[PDB]
Sequence to fold (1820 residues):
Amino acid sequence: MELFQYMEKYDYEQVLFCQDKESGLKAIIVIHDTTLGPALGGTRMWMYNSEEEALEDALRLARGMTYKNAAAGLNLGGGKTVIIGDPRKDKNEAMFRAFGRFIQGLNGRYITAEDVGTTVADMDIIYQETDYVTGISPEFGNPSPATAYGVYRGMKAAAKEAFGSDSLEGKVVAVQGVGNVAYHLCRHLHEEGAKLIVTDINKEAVARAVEEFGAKAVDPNDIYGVECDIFAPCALGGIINDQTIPQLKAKVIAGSANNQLKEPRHGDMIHEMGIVYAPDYVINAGGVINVADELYGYNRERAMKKIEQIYDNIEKVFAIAKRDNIPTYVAADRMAEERIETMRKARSQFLQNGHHILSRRRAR
Amino acid sequence: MELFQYMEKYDYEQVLFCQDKESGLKAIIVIHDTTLGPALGGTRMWMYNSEEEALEDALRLARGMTYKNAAAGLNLGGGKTVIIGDPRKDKNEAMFRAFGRFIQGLNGRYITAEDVGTTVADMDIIYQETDYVTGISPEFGNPSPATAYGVYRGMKAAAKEAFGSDSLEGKVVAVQGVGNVAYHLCRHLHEEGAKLIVTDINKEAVARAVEEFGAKAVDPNDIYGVECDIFAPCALGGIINDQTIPQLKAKVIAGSANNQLKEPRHGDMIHEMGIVYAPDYVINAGGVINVADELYGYNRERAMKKIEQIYDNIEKVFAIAKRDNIPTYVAADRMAEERIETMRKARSQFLQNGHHILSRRRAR
Amino acid sequence: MELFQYMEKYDYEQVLFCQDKESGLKAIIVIHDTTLGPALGGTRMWMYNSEEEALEDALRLARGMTYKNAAAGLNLGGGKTVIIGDPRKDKNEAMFRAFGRFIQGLNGRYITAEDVGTTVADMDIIYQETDYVTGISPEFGNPSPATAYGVYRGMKAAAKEAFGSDSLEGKVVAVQGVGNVAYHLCRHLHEEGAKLIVTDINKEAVARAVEEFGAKAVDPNDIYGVECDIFAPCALGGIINDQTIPQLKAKVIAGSANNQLKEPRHGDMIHEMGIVYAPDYVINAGGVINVADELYGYNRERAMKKIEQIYDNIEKVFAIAKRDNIPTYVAADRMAEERIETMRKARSQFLQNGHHILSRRRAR
Amino acid sequence: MELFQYMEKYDYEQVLFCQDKESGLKAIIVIHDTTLGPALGGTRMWMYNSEEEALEDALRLARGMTYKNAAAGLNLGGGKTVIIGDPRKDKNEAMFRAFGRFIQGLNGRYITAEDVGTTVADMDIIYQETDYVTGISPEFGNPSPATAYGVYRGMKAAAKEAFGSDSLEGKVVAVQGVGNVAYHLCRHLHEEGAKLIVTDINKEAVARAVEEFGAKAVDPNDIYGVECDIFAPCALGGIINDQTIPQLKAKVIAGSANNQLKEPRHGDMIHEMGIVYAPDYVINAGGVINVADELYGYNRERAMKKIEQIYDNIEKVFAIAKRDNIPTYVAADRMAEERIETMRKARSQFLQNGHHILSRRRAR
Amino acid sequence: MELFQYMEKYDYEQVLFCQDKESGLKAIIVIHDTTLGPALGGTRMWMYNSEEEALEDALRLARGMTYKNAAAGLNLGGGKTVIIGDPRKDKNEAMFRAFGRFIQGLNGRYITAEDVGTTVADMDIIYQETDYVTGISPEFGNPSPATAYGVYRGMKAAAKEAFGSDSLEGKVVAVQGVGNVAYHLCRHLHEEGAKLIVTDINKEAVARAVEEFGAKAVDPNDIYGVECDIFAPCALGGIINDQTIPQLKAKVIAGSANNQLKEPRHGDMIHEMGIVYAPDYVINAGGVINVADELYGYNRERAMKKIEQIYDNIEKVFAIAKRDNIPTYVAADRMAEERIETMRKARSQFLQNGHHILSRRRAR
Ligand SMILES: NC(=O)c1ccc[n+]([C@@H]2O[C@H](COP(=O)([O-])OP(=O)(O)OC[C@H]3O[C@@H](n4cnc5c(N)ncnc54)[C@H](O)[C@@H]3O)[C@@H](O)[C@H]2O)c1
Ligand SMILES: NC(=O)c1ccc[n+]([C@@H]2O[C@H](COP(=O)([O-])OP(=O)(O)OC[C@H]3O[C@@H](n4cnc5c(N)ncnc54)[C@H](O)[C@@H]3O)[C@@H](O)[C@H]2O)c1
Ligand SMILES: NC(=O)c1ccc[n+]([C@@H]2O[C@H](COP(=O)([O-])OP(=O)(O)OC[C@H]3O[C@@H](n4cnc5c(N)ncnc54)[C@H](O)[C@@H]3O)[C@@H](O)[C@H]2O)c1
Ligand SMILES: NC(=O)c1ccc[n+]([C@@H]2O[C@H](COP(=O)([O-])OP(=O)(O)OC[C@H]3O[C@@H](n4cnc5c(N)ncnc54)[C@H](O)[C@@H]3O)[C@@H](O)[C@H]2O)c1
Ligand SMILES: NC(=O)c1ccc[n+]([C@@H]2O[C@H](COP(=O)([O-])OP(=O)(O)OC[C@H]3O[C@@H](n4cnc5c(N)ncnc54)[C@H](O)[C@@H]3O)[C@@H](O)[C@H]2O)c1
Fold:
């Protein structure tokens, strides 16, 4: 692969291949940047056809988590674990005890959380070996009201961008998927008093939506052509593709879905038309904020006060996009890199007793 | 300025000029005295025309905080920070991360709090770099009921000075400004059963006052000439000036406003007439007590029990003023300096494991 | 002075005005940069006519120590203390106990050493209050053989620059001043087998030089016109001025004197002629290396092995000067700033247990 | 006094004379025995005519607290402080800050609490200097329900001694004094369903007693001659004197009063008659148990479960009194000394990490 | 005795009566002042007729050690232990193990050393229980060359006072007693080249003195009338009495004997005549400096460099005596009290990590 070429083109710190034979563990931990703080990342268990599939996937997700944690305002880096196995039939205790010792042997340099493939029952076996695991605690045990609240605030900011007013009484919001994250979103949007147009691949969830908030049951294939204001995709990625760009009649795209643009040329075309696209990983970053506020000792009010700042994050993305005459998906990356370089240069004076995110401190 | 002459005439320990270029921070931390404990002080952000304006302002406020923290009964010194900038447009994260590291590099020798110009959203960025910051905690998050309760107790003490009885059923209290601190004061004064005469530059707050407690709406320019007993200024400083001294018909001045006397000759004239002036920084010291009780781990009952002692503080000020045949604004300074010198001499025996206000101790 | 303008033009971290009234201390500690490590600097006691004289002097010496400690290879920053007093009649214990507590209250952020005005009898009073003081220890108690050894190595490097050969058998070295630092230098130069031409304002030291190593007694005013190879000034600063540049018949200037060029235009003219000027603060940095190796627990062999690298330091200065087509006194500053920026960027990965120069570690 | 003779006859460890001149403190701390644990004792402020009065008083109370803390089941020794002053007019902050440093300088070897003469407002000034102070905490802030509950349990045990049955439905209890400790006692005695005969020097408290529980208002001088079963003195000491022994018609004396027997010959005569006298410092030891359970972090259920054991303490006193053919006031001392000697001999095996009552341990 | 009156007239911190019955220990520890540091004092074992004899003796020696440790330049207070027993027949291990635990229970607040009555074989039993004991270590094991060296330096200073020249070639020194401390003194005085006149109650030591350095054997009763310059008493106290003042023909009294003046009226008469009396506890303080330098880890060169400063101590005593127009034995007390008050006021700024003499620090 010439793996140091791929590392050198993007400045990856480490890739790290763990293995354990009596338990059957093959894991790839990738730490991209640990400038702001420790590298928080999800632990994803999935079956890949080779090692190179898993390696490329771990490297892309490490870069993505660095820009997410930076542009969210967290003092955390970016990394990602891939466990090569099958989560239906290739789990036991022994691989997670082996894996928790491989995390404890990095000495706090990498913090893990649950992701696609692991549950909060495998981060209890890891917690028996390490402290550097999050999303576990009896105080904590559910990021979906948090992610919905952050999508709500980002939609406020994008509405003040595209229109000037953020009071959404008198707006039309089309929402695809009502799966636990757009559901609380639809709670927030009707409790403000906005009109809702929902769809889903199921109908029982659509029946729940119409019974709760009087939404409009529309078929899933033509959610794209609905004349609305704010289109909020919450189902999958690759939704904005070449096959669907002229189908839109909305000017504000702000949803919780990951990897919304299929190719960056689509983002170029959206910026040439005029659809106000707030970027994908700045809006939906509420769940990562929620699971990173556990590192203080979890408190609901502090974490919701931090999730409230996604309004300001989106507003700075649009300010940089209008200053630099670039699209907004480029403005998100440049916001994050400016925060990384500025905190490299502004935290340079010597202290022999500095605080990081894992520090021992006063109870207060 | 010959800055060591000004430091030597009043025994300032340190002045300390912080600077950071990539974040735009220019700060002046002034530590006057750290005999009793660490130097607690506010962090004030304001735009000054030069450096000398900010320097003179920081030095005056450092001396003022030393006498306030001493005469309140706290084990804390006096200092003050001035950040030279514009709080409407010259804030970001990077200057407060730089500034929090400059506080952490004093090693607990200076504790900061919010003041005129900063909020409790900038002491969360400082808290990511240091423990020596107060007014932040999720247990804590509001000094105004505390400051009003302390003004109430000091008015009890001044009423027992001027009359002998502290039960205020049958008294007349004129209050200017109903802005969040005299409001709870008016709650306390009518729940004792005293008659209220309020005024304000607004009328909606006056309407709220009349609707709540049946106060008397009087115009703001002639609040000074109202025949009353206890005049409680709660709006600005420089109220007692030469233009308004013969306007008074009250004999007890006890309000929460800072810098009440314009010049000390006015205090000389008040003492020559006979108006019982309890001093400004002894009465309104309840908010500093509230934000300094957080250093124990915040508890409401302990802090209110400590705010209750402003009765005794005012009573000792009047005892020293009658012992020493001086005015009361001089009696406040001499009370504070006697407490400083007595705790210098009475805490002189050696211990290798002493407790200060920042010490680690048993949870209990 | 508009002191933040002068701080912002050169990126000073702190200026810090200490004062103590019962002991008579007025001190100015200036910390320029603490990127590489703590700020090591001398404590200089001298009488200045005002505060502004002392302030300008402290600021210049702080910048000079930053570039010296950087270009020497040390993990130390640059700072400087000025005590405003008279060392003949205004010393006692009480000001150094007060001053040692003001250094201990920076928490290791600034390390002090002896300099022009203090002795190793005032850094014993400071040592009773702090650990952040160097040059004191009973293992240690004499930087002059170290500084001479470093001047010897730098002269080796400048001789290989100007000629190609470093074996100095068959060279002519003119040395002014034989005061304890050029004396061991003349030991090294005749034990290699090089011819010496010494001078001094005294004659008894010249008699000692001629009796020891057979040097040539030449008058002090015409040491400049002596036809030689390597001219080694070791007396004062401002030697290379406009009045003496055409007097030289030497092509290698390498001496232990501080502030050799009077103005940088003189360095421009030296580079236009062709005299190989190795810069002043790269050669004579052996004494600072000697007093900074005490921070490990002093060992003579490790410190001499570190002083041996001034050959490589001079060789990199000449490599940058030939790469960048600038003079050598500019090449020294650019070497130091490249080392500062490169160690800012190469030590950026997170550790929660990093080592600095003041760290506790294994005895081994 | 030949003070070491008095110390040697009873094995006092230390007497310790503290003094502070600028605050006016003259204190006598007496530590009798610290075998079981640290010496807990009250701090009593009172005016004595000389030093010898205070010294004899401190020595008697130190021995009394050793036998109380031993026979109660606590891991605490016995000591006592006497401050020589006047609590009406000779208190300030400075003497308690001086005194708290003199307690902190014993290093946990002596723990102080409130007693006759100090309040819980002087153990807040001491708490600013030391951890070895009890009865202060915001969790804690009232030993009187505890002392009453313990008197109730001891009366249960004495009733099973004198009769065999502990169910007190159908008994007659005469109680003198209804001052906050016999009041909750009378609550417990009527909620079991026992008949009450109360008296007091006041009548309003007697009116409260008759209105609450239907007690019988009897004059205070002839409470001694009332035909009853269990006489419970709760007012003063010296009640059982020669003038009142034939006045009794009761066979169970069990009250919360200190120093009940005037001379031990009275206890000899009570044991010769047959009145079941449970001793004074075994019954009323509930308040000391309450203020010593704060040293764990105060919990109400654990402390009440420990106060419940006074039944077993009284039962062992009567078992030793019937085994050894001695009176019961001698049986209390011998119970305590057997516990002291047995815990000297049974805790003799070496540990390098033992637990005492002041130890740091797991939160759990 | 009214022991708090005697404590209050001189500001004694503590008197502390230890006792242990199974070992037979009766000890009186007196701590006078612990402002400068911990209280260093000797442990003296002697038989006194009562307690009051021992108590008065302990109090006088505590005050004397405070002024000695202050005027010597040490960071140590003054205290003194008296053990009431007979050192010929009333020692064992058990009393020193009991006593070492009573010193460890003061927590470093009092440091003990050997004195009249104990040896360095009883401070090995104490060292098995505590660290706060000095004069014991295998590095250490002999204050007499130190005390002689300090007497030599003080005699240098008194010779420059009385004459102007300190080079003692051509002087006459009469020395009584040649017992281990004047012996090394006579070594120093003839190795400078001064003429010696020795005497002693023995003759074999006088024969050793004449054989070594050619001294002059003079009878012991008329050592006082010898026409000399510097009279150096080294035998006992009470030498300068009314019976011997006109016998002197010397003008410089500088010897190592304790308690040289019988009454202070004798010192008044010496100052009225003109005999330059350097005070007793400033000259002979070399042994206390030697045993207090062990607290750093003992090093001979550092301790001798500190003993060298007795020249400067005597010079400041004479400067204060000529400034204040008082005798010199009063000038010694006022030098010490000025050092105590100045270090109370100059070490007042807050640090949470200060160094004292018992602090843990870097090995270096
Ligand atoms: N929960 C969080 O905090 C968080 C964080 C980041 C991203 N997200 C993203 O939010 C999206 C959904 O959230 P979730 O995974 O937590 O719950 P979810 O998977 O239950 O919600 C998805 C629902 O969308 C519907 N769906 C599937 N295909 C669809 C299609 N073509 N068209 C319309 N609807 C379709 C289904 O009802 C599905 O249950 C996901 O893309 C997830 O990655 C969530
Ligand atoms: N909150 C505290 O704990 C605390 C502590 C110390 C001092 N203070 C002082 O209390 C004063 C007011 O308290 P605040 O700042 O917290 O709330 P605030 O500023 O809202 O109250 C001030 C109100 O007074 C009225 N006002 C302005 N000018 C007036 C004028 N000429 N005449 C009459 N009323 C006028 C306005 O209604 C104003 O809102 C201030 O001077 C403040 O410095 C408060
Ligand atoms: N010792 C070190 O480690 C070190 C470090 C850095 C710089 N230096 C520099 O080295 C120089 C001298 O070293 P030093 O101060 O340690 O010992 P030093 O002061 O005793 O040596 C200087 C001697 O030069 C002679 N001198 C004075 N004026 C002269 C003149 N016009 N011409 C010729 N000679 C003259 C005198 O003999 C003088 O004693 C100084 O400039 C010092 O700053 C020394
Ligand atoms: N509160 C405790 O935990 C505790 C602990 C140990 C001992 N005690 C003892 O309990 C006794 C009383 O308890 P307290 O001090 O806490 O409250 P208290 O002092 O208010 O109760 C005493 C009351 O007894 C009455 N009194 C006074 N003289 C009397 C007399 N000749 N005859 C009858 N009644 C008389 C008065 O009403 C008095 O208020 C005291 O002797 C106290 O020492 C209490
Ligand atoms: N060793 C120290 O560091 C130190 C410190 C402080 C004080 N001193 C004092 O130094 C004095 C002697 O020193 P030492 O005790 O260590 O050794 P030491 O007791 O052996 O020296 C005293 C000698 O003086 C002689 N002596 C006794 N009576 C005499 C008399 N009337 N006239 C002349 N000589 C007489 C004897 O030879 C005696 O041995 C003592 O007063 C001691 O208190 C010593």
Notes: The pocket of nicotinamide-adenine-dinucleotide (ligand 2) is lined by residues B 143-144, 147, 176-177, 179-181, 200-202, 205, 220, 234-236, 256-258, 284, 287 (CB under 6 Å).
